[PDB]
Amino acid sequence: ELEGKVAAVTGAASGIGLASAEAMLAAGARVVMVDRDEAALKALCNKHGDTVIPLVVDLLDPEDCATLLPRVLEKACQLDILHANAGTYVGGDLVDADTMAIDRMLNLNVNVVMKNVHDVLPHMIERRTGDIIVTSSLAAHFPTPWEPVYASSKWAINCFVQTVRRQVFKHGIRVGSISPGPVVSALLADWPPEKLKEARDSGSLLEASDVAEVVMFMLTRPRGMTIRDVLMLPTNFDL
Amino acid sequence: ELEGKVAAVTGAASGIGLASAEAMLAAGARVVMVDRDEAALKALCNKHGDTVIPLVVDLLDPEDCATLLPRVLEKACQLDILHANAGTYVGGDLVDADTMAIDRMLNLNVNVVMKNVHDVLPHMIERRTGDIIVTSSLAAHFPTPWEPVYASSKWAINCFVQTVRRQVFKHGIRVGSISPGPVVSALLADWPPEKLKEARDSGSLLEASDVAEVVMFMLTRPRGMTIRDVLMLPTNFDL
Amino acid sequence: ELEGKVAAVTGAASGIGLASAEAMLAAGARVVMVDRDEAALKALCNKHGDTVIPLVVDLLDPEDCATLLPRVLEKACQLDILHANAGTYVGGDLVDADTMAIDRMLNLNVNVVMKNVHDVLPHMIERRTGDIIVTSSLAAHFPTPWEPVYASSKWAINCFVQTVRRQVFKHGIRVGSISPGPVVSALLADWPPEKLKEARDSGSLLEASDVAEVVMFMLTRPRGMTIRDVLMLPTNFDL
Amino acid sequence: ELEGKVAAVTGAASGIGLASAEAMLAAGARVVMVDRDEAALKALCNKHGDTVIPLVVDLLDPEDCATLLPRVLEKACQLDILHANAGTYVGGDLVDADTMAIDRMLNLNVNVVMKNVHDVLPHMIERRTGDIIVTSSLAAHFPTPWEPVYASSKWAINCFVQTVRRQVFKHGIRVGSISPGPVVSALLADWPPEKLKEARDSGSLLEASDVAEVVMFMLTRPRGMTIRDVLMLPTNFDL
Ligand SMILES: OC[C@@H](O)[C@@H](O)[C@H](O)[C@@H](O)CO
Ligand SMILES: OC[C@@H](O)[C@@H](O)[C@H](O)[C@@H](O)CO
Ligand SMILES: OC[C@@H](O)[C@@H](O)[C@H](O)[C@@H](O)CO
Ligand SMILES: OC[C@@H](O)[C@@H](O)[C@H](O)[C@@H](O)CO
């Protein structure tokens, strides 16, 4: 079980963040779902009763990112887990892409992730026990030619995770990430035609509910042990 | 459960291979323990009844490595899993080390691992379903200055695993590895004084029984999904 | 020689960008020095005569980053080389650092670098011949525990460079980077006390004039060949 | 110039080792060419006069690898440079390849390289000044799916080089490697049909004489600076 522990999930309104939030709830926890889409959250706040706490944060406003931390402790307190799942996608060639989404992407996939971790760590250091999981990707361990802006952001995540945990583990904290291949998501529309055609694998891609069990296996682990990364991909995906 | 599946484990006579073999047996499987030490195996063949099949193979004789495959099918058949856990250690500076152990190490940590995989794959391609797990290390993802010969071998393993699975997954096969930090083992005597002192962490290092559960989680996984690597280390180990 | 070719250098007002700009000038080229400090540039515009073109760009305003490209072609045209040397530093623990510099850093070390490349590439694709060099770091190939925010940005650069060149080389373009260890720079004040003490190596660290010769060796290279990266560090630096 | 320095080159009888040996000779040095093919060496010993010293070493006999070091000091002494260029190739799928060449390859591409370095280092530590260059490959920085056995060996080389230099640089020694893409070589016959077709690039591949100049640039470098690696590939090669 997850006893009476509290967890926060960015981008929880949909996709992996959604699957991760629902799986934590099952194990017995209050979960604070964070995303920009309140209308999407609303439907979750009721058919999930009481234990689902919504928190609307653009997360792309420096003022909003800082709202995050205290608001969690305000709304529920008892923070023991953070899951920075918030992420986007930009694929194809570098030209033919706008300067805009780029900025927005790296800031959400890198800047936001770091700031969130930076802002929630003081709590865990006083309290001791802390747990942090970042949503990485298979692109963190491969130079995928068709997503230069996306893979690079995940390479930054790879470094950041293993390096930051080296300066925090003395305070009873665990840090890790999940590096999944392609997964069913609205983000699949943001792909280029390079591959995708690959993602037509009758090896039904990866289901977002499957990675959540890995997240649980990472959380539900002897405190003495830390799982820093997990490389998972659809068996019938060529990479 | 592991139904009536059969598995083979190199270096199963002790350490991680030993923990891995025992955990498979629990899930319900015949396991072929492979190692050079028959006297060590003997004690396992009886107090583990019937389901423990011994196979004495030096594994450092080209003639013996080839004995491996048919002998498994001879002794029990029904091979669905291979675990290349056989490995050794060489630490310290490069000078002050003998040319000999080196050769012996790389051959066992690289040459033997590959040959074993090469020799058991034909079976799985005809049969379809196959599963392969290689025992890697945290050194596969770090340039540890105090074990030049050991880390490099694990970097080769990192490449080999993810690259070989790209040319086999079309035949219903899963390939992956486990990259654990330091673990209680007779190999701990082979360490230099560089760190080790680190391994005095009252964060009781890593227990070999804990990684075995990760191996099960890798095996006991939807066939559609493949876990390629798992980074685990003692929480109180600085790396 | 660099014939009548033109080059642009970000952060050219000081440090590696300064050394790189001066070395190009020697080989025979007009160089557009780009930086926020006009007063620093001014002194360079006169004691370097005619061939030094200044361009004041904050580079941390989306409106200013887009000013870059046309202004180069406006001020001098004939662009054949881009050098994205602009970068900053953030070291120490993650806590004890402000959310602000972080954002500013990743945006300059990642977002700005990409946008600059994105905006200058169309020219080279029409013209054919193009050359791009990014200033990376030794941290691009190591998880330095004491600079989590800086190393991660360089890991992104490592991916970005080798991956972007795979989708441009068909148009007669070369892309690469330089990954130097610590070098004498005003950025040395931004270091933590972790190491630095190392940088007291009577092995006089690395001189910024030495890396510039590597840049020339990268540029001054058979067009048929592309140098993608160069790992250089002070001989007496432990990493 | 290379003053009156002496250098040793493994696999110098042909290919990159051949180009490297000839380029050193030009700069002014005695060079000991090492290879299994005496008949190939013979033709070099005469039309290259006096400064070319042959040394026939199988290099795949543990007894022969140890012959190496003293014999160099026997034949010429004054060793200041070692170049471990000796290497082979194995491509295609893992099945369809023999256990034999594999063993032979990893031993020559990994075991032999290490042993050679291990055996020549004591000299340089007493003498102080030393220089070591290992012939790596682009495969050291990519998981090439069509050469599992070759790339993995180069990943080991990548670790070995940067990690070994960390425990030797205090004795006035420089260590590095060259990571070139595909190059014209008799080893081109050992390729699979996967790509090769790529190597039909009218971007004339890479010429072995071009990498030698990089080697010189690595050697001919301020002692205070060490070039640890150089990533070079044919501009019109997709990787
Ligand atoms: O939804 C994005 C996906 O989860 C990510 O993993 C990459 O797109 C994939 O790895 C391709 O490299
Ligand atoms: O028993 C060996 C250990 O399991 C291995 O993981 C390394 O020694 C460790 O990672 C140090 O880098
Ligand atoms: O000025 C910054 C320096 O050039 C950079 O290279 C890193 O600080 C160094 O590598 C430490 O890892
Ligand atoms: O002759 C071998 C070649 O030099 C090597 O570099 C690889 O074959 C190439 O990189 C393919 O990955």
Tell me C16's DSSP state.
H
Report the distance separating Cα B186 and Cα A17, nearest Å.
42
Residues A116, A64 contacting (CB under 8 angstroms): no
| Contact B181 CB / ligand 2 (< 6 Å) | yes
Work out how many domains chain A is built from and give that number: 1
Report the distance separating Cα A229 and Cα D205, nearest Å.
38
Q: How far is the CA of C231 from the centre of ligand 3 (A)?
A: 12
Q: Which residues contact A95 (CB under 8 A, 6 or more apart)?
A: C118, C121, C122, C125
Which chains have at least 3 CB atom pairs separated by less than 8 Å from chain D? B, C
Residue with tokens 């007493």: D126
Using a CB–CB cut-off of 8 Å, the residues of B that contact D are 62, 65-66, 93-95, 97, 99-100, 102-103, 106-107, 110-111, 114-115, 117-119, 121-122, 125, 143-146, 148-149, 151-153, 155-160, 162-164, 166-168
Buried b (16+ CB within 10 A) or exposed e, A35-60: beeeeebeebeeebeeebbbbbbebe
Q: Which residue from C169, C214, C217 is facing D235, i.e. has the nearest CB?
A: C169
Q: Which residue from B100, B145, B162 is facing D163, i.e. has the nearest CB?
A: B145
Residues B169, B224 contacting (CB under 8 angstroms): no
| Alpha helices (H) along chain A | 16-28, 38-47, 62-75, 99-106, 112-127, 148-164, 208-219
CATH of the domain at D12: 3.40.50.720
Which chains have at least 3 CB atom pairs separated by less than 8 Å from chain A? B, C
Q: Which residues contact C137 (CB under 8 A, 6 or more apart)?
A: C150, C151, C154, C179, C180, C181
Q: Which of D134, D104, D101 is nearest to D117 (CA)?
A: D134
User: Which residue in D129, D210, D230 has the most chain C C-beta atoms within 10 A of its own C-beta, making it the best mutation to test that interface?
Assistant: D230
Side chain identity, residue D198: E
Half-sphere CA count of B96, side-chain side, radius 13 A: 12
Residues in the ligand 1 pocket, defined by CB under 6 Å: A 89, 137-139, 144, 180-183, 185, 187
Report the distance separating Cα C221 and Cα C210, nearest Å.
17
List D16, D22, D133, D150, catalytic entry: D150
Report the distance separating Cα B113 and Cα B106, nearest Å.
10
Report the distance separating Cα D223 and Cα D202, nearest Å.
39
Q: How far is the CA of B18 from the centre of ligand 2 (A)?
A: 17
Backbone angles phi, psi at C144, to 5 degrees: -60, 115
What six digits make up the tokens of D103?
A: 């063993």
Q: Which residues contact B170 (CB under 8 A, 6 or more apart)?
A: A236
Q: Which residues contact A182 (CB under 8 A, 6 or more apart)?
A: A138, A188, A199, A205, A206, A233, A234, A237
Helix axes A148-164, C148-165, angle to 10 degrees: 150
Q: Can you name the residues that pair with C31 across neighbouring β-strands?
A: C7, C52
Half-sphere CA count of D231, side-chain side, radius 13 A: 21
Residues D15, D186 contacting (CB under 8 angstroms): yes
Angle (CA) D58-D61-D64 rounded to 5° is: 65
What six digits make up the tokens of B71?
A: 């002998």
Helix-then-strand count for chain D, H and E: 7, 7
Residues D132, D173 contacting (CB under 8 angstroms): yes
Report the distance separating Cα A202 and Cα A184, nearest Å.
13
Buried b (16+ CB within 10 A) or exposed e, A134-150: bbbbbbbbbbbbbbbbb
Half-sphere CA count of B49, side-chain side, radius 13 A: 0
Report the distance separating Cα C121 and Cα C81, nearest Å.
10
Q: Can you name the residues that pair with B66 across neighbouring β-strands?
A: none
Sort C76 into a burial class: Cβ within 10 Å, 0-12 / 13-18 / 19+. Answer: middle
Enter the resolution in angstroms.
Answer: 2.9
Residues in the ligand 3 pocket, defined by CB under 6 Å: C 89, 137-139, 144, 180-183, 185, 187
Angle (CA) D88-D91-D93 rounded to 5° is: 150
Q: Measured between CA atoms, how close is B94 to chain A, in angstroms?
A: 27
Chain C residues with beta carbon closer than 8 angstroms to that of A152? 110, 155-157, 159-160, 163
Q: Which residue from B174, B228, B238 is facing A166, i.e. has the nearest CB?
A: B238
Sort D69 into a burial class: Cβ within 10 Å, 0-12 / 13-18 / 19+. Answer: buried
Using a CB–CB cut-off of 8 Å, the residues of A that contact B are 141, 162, 166, 169-170, 172, 174, 176, 203-204, 206, 210, 214, 217, 222-236, 238-239
Point out the ligand 1 atom lying closest to the alpha carbon of residue A206. 4
- Nearest listed ligand to the Cα of residue C182: 3
| Contact B144 CB / ligand 2 (< 6 Å) | yes
Report the distance separating Cα C114 and Cα C160, nearest Å.
8
Backbone angles phi, psi at D221, to 5 degrees: -140, 145
What six digits make up the tokens of B99?
A: 């040319």
* Helix, strand, or coil (residue A122): helix
Sign of CA dihedral B41, B44, B45, B51: negative
Per-position DSSP letters for C83-118, written without gaps between them? EE-------S-STTS-HHHHHHHHIIIIIHHHHHHH
Half-sphere CA count of A191, side-chain side, radius 13 A: 17
* Technique used by the depositors: X-ray
Residue with tokens 């055609």: A197
| Smallest CA–CA distance from D149 into chain B, residue | B160
Sign of CA dihedral D103, D109, D115, D119: positive
User: Which residue in C204, C221, C226 has the most chain D C-beta atoms within 10 A of its own C-beta, making it the best mutation to test that interface?
Assistant: C226
Report the distance separating Cα B75 and Cα C230, nearest Å.
53
Report the distance separating Cα A212 and Cα A51, nearest Å.
18
User: In this structure, how many other beta carbons lie within 10 angstroms of the beta carbon of residue A123?
Assistant: 17
Residues B58, B86 contacting (CB under 8 angstroms): no
Half-sphere CA count of A121, side-chain side, radius 13 A: 23
Chain A residues with beta carbon closer than 8 angstroms to that of C169? none
Residues B17, B135 contacting (CB under 8 angstroms): yes
Q: Which residue from D172, D174, D227 is facing C230, i.e. has the nearest CB?
A: D227
Helix axes C148-165, C112-127, angle to 10 degrees: 20
Sign of CA dihedral C140, C142, C143, C145: negative
Report the distance separating Cα D12 and Cα D6, nearest Å.
14
Side chain identity, residue C183: V
Which structural domain, as residue segments, surrounds residue A132?
1-239
Q: Can you name the residues that pair with A135 across neighbouring β-strands?
A: A178
List the beta strands (DSSP E) in D181-224: none
Sign of CA dihedral A84, A90, A95, A96: negative
Report the distance separating Cα A205 and Cα B120, nearest Å.
27
Sort C98 into a burial class: Cβ within 10 Å, 0-12 / 13-18 / 19+. Answer: exposed
What six digits make up the tokens of A109?
A: 């996939």
Point out the ligand 4 atom lying closest to the alpha carbon of residue D89. 2
Do D224 and C232 lie within an 8 Å CB cutoff?
no
Q: How far is the CA of D138 from the centre of ligand 4 (A)?
A: 6
Which chains have at least 3 CB atom pairs separated by less than 8 Å from chain C? A, D
What six digits make up the tokens of D143?
A: 């998981």
Report the distance separating Cα C62 and Cα C70, nearest Å.
14
Do A152 and C152 lie within an 8 Å CB cutoff?
no
Q: Which residues contact A135 (CB under 8 A, 6 or more apart)?
A: A11, A16, A17, A83, A84, A85, A86, A87, A177, A178
Residues A217, B217 contacting (CB under 8 angstroms): yes
**What's the Cα-to-Cα distance from A30 to each of A5, A55, A212, rounded to whole Å?**
7, 13, 16
User: In this structure, how many other beta carbons lie within 10 angstroms of the beta carbon of residue B129?
Assistant: 13
Residues A135, A160 contacting (CB under 8 angstroms): no
Quote the distance between the C-alpha of residue D56 and its chain's center.
Answer: 16
What six digits make up the tokens of D6?
A: 């002496």
Tell me B97's DSSP state.
S
Residue with tokens 């074990």: B147
The H or E element spanning position B232 is strand B225-234
Q: Which of C80, C88, C79, C78 is nearest to C112 (CA)?
A: C88
Report the distance separating Cα B178 and Cα D80, nearest Å.
41
Report the distance separating Cα C111 and Cα C101, nearest Å.
14
Report the distance separating Cα A94 and Cα A99, nearest Å.
10
User: In this structure, how many other beta carbons lie within 10 angstroms of the beta carbon of residue D125?
Assistant: 14
* Helix, strand, or coil (residue C142): coil
Side chain identity, residue A217: F
Report the distance separating Cα C21 and Cα C25, nearest Å.
6
Q: Which of B164, C228, B135, A199 is nearest to D144 (CA)?
A: B164
Residues A114, C102 contacting (CB under 8 angstroms): yes
Q: Which of A138, A151, A17, A163 is nearest to A84 (CA)?
A: A17
Q: Which of B115, B82, B66 is nearest to B6 (CA)?
A: B82
Q: Which of A63, A77, A87, A72 is nearest to A12 (CA)?
A: A87
Residues D170, D164 contacting (CB under 8 angstroms): no
List the beta strands (DSSP E) in chain C: 5-10, 29-35, 52-56, 79-84, 130-135, 173-180, 225-234
Q: Which of D72, D14, D16, D77 is nearest to D43 (CA)?
A: D14
List the beta strands (DSSP E) in B57-206: 79-84, 130-135, 173-180
